[PDB]
Design a protein around this nucleic acid. Sequence first.
DNA 1: ATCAGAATCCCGGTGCCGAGGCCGCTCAATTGGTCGTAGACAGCTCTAGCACCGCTTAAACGCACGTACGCGCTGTCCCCCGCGTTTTAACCGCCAAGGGGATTACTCCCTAGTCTCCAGGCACGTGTCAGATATATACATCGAT
DNA 2: ATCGATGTATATATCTGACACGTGCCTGGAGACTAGGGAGTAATCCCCTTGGCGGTTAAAACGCGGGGGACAGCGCGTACGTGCGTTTAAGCGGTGCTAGAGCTGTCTACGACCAATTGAGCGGCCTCGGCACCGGGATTCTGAT
Lengths: 109, 106, 104, 97, 98, 80, 82, 180, 95, 97, 96
Amino acid sequence: RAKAKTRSSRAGLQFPVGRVHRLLRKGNYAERVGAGAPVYLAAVLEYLTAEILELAGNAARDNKKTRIIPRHLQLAVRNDEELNKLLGRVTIAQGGVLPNIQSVLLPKK
Amino acid sequence: KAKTRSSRAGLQFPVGRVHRLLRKGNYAERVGAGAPVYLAAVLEYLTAEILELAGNAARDNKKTRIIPRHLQLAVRNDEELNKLLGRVTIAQGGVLPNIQSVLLPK
Amino acid sequence: GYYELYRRSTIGNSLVDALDTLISDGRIEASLAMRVLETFDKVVAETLKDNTQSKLTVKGNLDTYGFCDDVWTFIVKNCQVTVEDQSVISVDKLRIVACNSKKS
Amino acid sequence: PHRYRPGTVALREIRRYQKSTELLIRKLPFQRLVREIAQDFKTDLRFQSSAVMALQEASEAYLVALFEDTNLCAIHAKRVTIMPKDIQLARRIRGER
Amino acid sequence: KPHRYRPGTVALREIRRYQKSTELLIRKLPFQRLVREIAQDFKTDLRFQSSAVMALQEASEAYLVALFEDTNLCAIHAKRVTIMPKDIQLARRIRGER
Amino acid sequence: RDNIQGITKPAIRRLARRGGVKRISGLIYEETRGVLKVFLENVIRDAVTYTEHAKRKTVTAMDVVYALKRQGRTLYGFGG
Amino acid sequence: VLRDNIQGITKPAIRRLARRGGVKRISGLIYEETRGVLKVFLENVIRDAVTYTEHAKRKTVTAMDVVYALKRQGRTLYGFGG
Amino acid sequence: SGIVPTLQNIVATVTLGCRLDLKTVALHARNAEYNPKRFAAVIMRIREPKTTALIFASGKMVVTGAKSEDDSKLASRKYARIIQKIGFAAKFTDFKIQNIVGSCDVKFPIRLEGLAFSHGTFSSYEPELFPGLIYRMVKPKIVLLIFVSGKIVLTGAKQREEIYQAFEAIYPVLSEFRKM
Amino acid sequence: KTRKESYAIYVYKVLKQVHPDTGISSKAMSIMNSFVNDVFERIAGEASRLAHYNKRSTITSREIQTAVRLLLPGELAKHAVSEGTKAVTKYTSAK
Amino acid sequence: RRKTRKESYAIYVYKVLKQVHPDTGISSKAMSIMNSFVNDVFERIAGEASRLAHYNKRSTITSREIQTAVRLLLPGELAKHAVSEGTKAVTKYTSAK
Amino acid sequence: NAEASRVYEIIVESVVNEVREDFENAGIDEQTLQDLKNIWQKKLTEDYLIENLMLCLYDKVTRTKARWKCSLKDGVVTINRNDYTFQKAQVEAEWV
DNA sequence: ATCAGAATCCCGGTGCCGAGGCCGCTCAATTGGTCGTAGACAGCTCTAGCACCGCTTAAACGCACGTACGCGCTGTCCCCCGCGTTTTAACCGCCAAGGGGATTACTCCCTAGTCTCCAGGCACGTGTCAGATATATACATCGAT
DNA sequence: ATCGATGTATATATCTGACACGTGCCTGGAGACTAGGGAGTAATCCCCTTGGCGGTTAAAACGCGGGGGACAGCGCGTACGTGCGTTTAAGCGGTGCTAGAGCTGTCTACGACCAATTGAGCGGCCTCGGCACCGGGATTCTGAT
């Protein structure tokens, strides 16, 4: 019998291909799930995770901290246009808001 | 002799088709016996509400045939169905005749 | 392709008088005469589209109207007409004949 | 001669086009615009006539709803004329700008 | 005379402070009690997980802050700085909540 | 009861300051209390419906998250 | 290759759409702003509809493709199939 | 009561029994109006009374504008005489009036919003579309065009005693909503 | 196939039950059919999510009832729940 | 007793984080947010692919439906990069066993 | 009558200078239209069931209870033995 | 421009509790092999989408002019903001009971699955009538004469 | 005030095409039966929620002066609406044709499914370091002169 080698290592991913396949099969999405569908979906999930993790780690470095907290995820999502569009209807707990003051409210000389 | 499930439930909507669509719609791996009966009853009631208010709107326009304009008037004048269909566009429905009071002449 | 009712005018029935006089004099014929009349029709159409400028109105009381074959006809009694391009003329009776501007 | 007060035939137009139900944009220019837009996404495309009609229904309903919000935020600014900033405010509050 | 800031300087300082921070701006026990009296209208003798009330408070505060952003923008559209309730009606009406 | 008055004037001022509001009229407090109350009625009504469907007596964080996702406004960080 | 058909959404058409919306008085820059808004709206809907069409390996945009593209955007349309 | 309605308009139709080629009657009959792309009937009017006719190709024609039933019958006979002088085998038959129009005034304003509230079974008032109530009286089959100005106009009858009975029936219910 | 499946005749029967003198346009029938498919899909999706949330694998009358309470506004929800329970009671009684 | 297993993407998000920022940590609440994000995006893409398979009368969700759902949901640059990553992973998975 | 004199002058000049080619296809002479215009100018020296005349083109006809409004153009009136030419005309009368 | 003062930032010690790594269990993913059927592909059909042409005509467009409304300025006044003082209840910590969420075990009954029959519903075809259109009459309303 | 123009209601005739209805038929739903797994129910347990108590402290409530913004009013000028005549392209109607939708047949690879197994992944324990707090000095911003 061959040595067990996980599907995520075959696809070169960190996200679980097998767990995504099981969640697709039990999720009642279709009566059949293709072989490459969990691979592709796990790759897409890994890419989106990596994008938010670039932006949140950069937000944490800019705040001079080494841990990503909800504020860093909030800043990461809102300062990027496409992740803000993807999470437009999404609120992040303990994330706060973007620092934004309307220019007419600024004092005048 | 076979009698349909809609006649058993006293409905006009097809219980059998709703059961088939629930089974083939990939909603759960099993579908209860009372689920298509309940859902067909709910669909029939909502159809009855839309059609009653649309028939009233058609009588208001001196018409004996429901057009999309009557369905739009029925949906938008009733607040319950307006909340139900707030994100729904009705083709050839027009809008409600609403004028802002500021724009009216003095 | 235009409306053929302008021989009922003075200029038109004088042309038909001229053409059938020359027919009776024995050099022209019906084909020449008819081509004269449609050429007359085109040139009266163009001269009335371009080189008219006066302003003429008549107000009166109507006797008999009518509308058939794309032609309005009116009879107006005791009508007052005025001329401006300042003379007002009183005329007891006048008849109005017209056809639609866009030919079909 | 006789001339209407400025705003009266405007209001009668509002009443007429709110009473009516037909599509307000000329059908063929809208179809040409849809073809032009679709050339960006995929070449030599085809369209069902019902597809272009569905697009026109949706586009006109979207613009009429947007103009209702635009009129509301123009009235909110103590105006009756709608400005482009009225459309920008309506679109940003709606969440799309 | 004691030092007094001009009207609006402290307001801007508070804007910067509360936009820099992330904590809940409503006291937790009053919100707790408000959630419970609203929940009495739907089902008597209810209980709440602490995380449930915290989720409700996060959602309510995010909703109110976004509503105040739209309220501020539609007040500015009226060439104003103070927000009156007509601003809140305009924001909720354009947002399809009325 | 007075629990809607528990959403105090300084709390509404702080929420508006996070929203970037520089000046607040006096009627905003009652208006915001009404808006918050109807929002909470919708979300708690859906959460209690989710709870009663599970034959539960405690409103879980899942019920609130699910009710909010039904409302179209998705909350992260509380599970789901 | 079709070009400059956004101007086919004429000034009177935008005025009529405003009239149905209840607008009494219209500025002059409203027409250009509305043309831009209509353009971006149809790019969104037509991009989604062409994506739906290409997934079905078709070459024509079915009316149902437009209906699903509208439903995806929350702008549900009744009257062209469900 | 002490008021009798005044008659305004009578519409009546008369069949003739033959098919008509209306082009020749348009050519040979004065005051005739025909446009095939607009309306497929000729329209002509006479001096006595101020009334019109709508001759169709099927021979069925309608007379409206008269103010008395016998003089309307006389006008229909005159139109039949016109088409007989034209030369179609069209004889006078099937005379029946379709509707009579009566008007009256009450000389006081009406709390007709309250009348619509108290009589919502047959009342319809919504102001900017039409400023007059349309009351559908069932005994007899008469519709009502009433206004706040007091101009009581009612129509839908086949005989004058019917509209008289409708007027005396509506008289008390309009009288008990005298505005101010 | 050439076969197409629709809720046209059922909407027509409901219309004859409500107003037994009033017709309906084909375009209005298309709107009504799309309305029924939309409401069916919304209630079925909510019931599917209810079944998934409570780790159940069946759609029952309870799932549809709770989905109706979630999606329909309050007075419509009350009447639709009453209608659905009445129909389910009649179906089980008649078996 | 011993409570049942609660599956989460916590370890996978952490592995991705150690690849993308080798020295940056993450709090538990931020991990809960990222878990909710992965669950939400999984549900959105899977639901869109489910509807895609239902529309085309198919009963199988393949990589084509996942790709089209990704193109439908994600904005443009995110969509094209996610399609690139998914295609790369699928061709690498098929190249191996 | 000055403008109308110019009208018939240009119309007779017009007719005589198109009719060259479609007369000379038959090909007789030009003296015929010469003395035609000569004698032409000599000429121009002068019951309720179915000369004064006006003749033109119409645009629109509307009717009230008894009154019409009619906008009339492209014609020449024949009245009072003084033929006049108009750009626009309005005809309104009562029917009593 | 400048200075007193208040608010905020930079730096360091403390410390504490939560992130991260380790260990053990266990169950879910993996490997392997079978089998049914979903779909990929070929091929035919025939439908409707595109392209063209011509006529009509209603709509768009350009222009001209008046006017009313957007916008800027000013005055007022009032009502929110900043701040000091008093009160009050939020919050933290701790304890304690017990309600119910969660888990496990067992049974049973309810639905998936299958086979057979038959009729409900849909495609197709066809009479026919609701509505669009047009006329005439009476009445209300807006703005210019 | 009169009145011309515009909009609305009612009775009637015409014409059309979309609508309601009759019919075949065929495929999907109902009847009948079986099996097995999900769900209902009972029992347990333990944990998390509710409730209370105490202090203490920061936040809320209240009062007050004042100044800055809201709002009303006024003026003006320009941009927009109204109406005209001219231009133009939409729309209707018809014809042709062919690209492509859509359906059918067939065959094959692909995915559900089942059994054995093992190694990833989750719960649990423990630890140490990253960040919050406290405290002090340096920096920046603000109001008045």
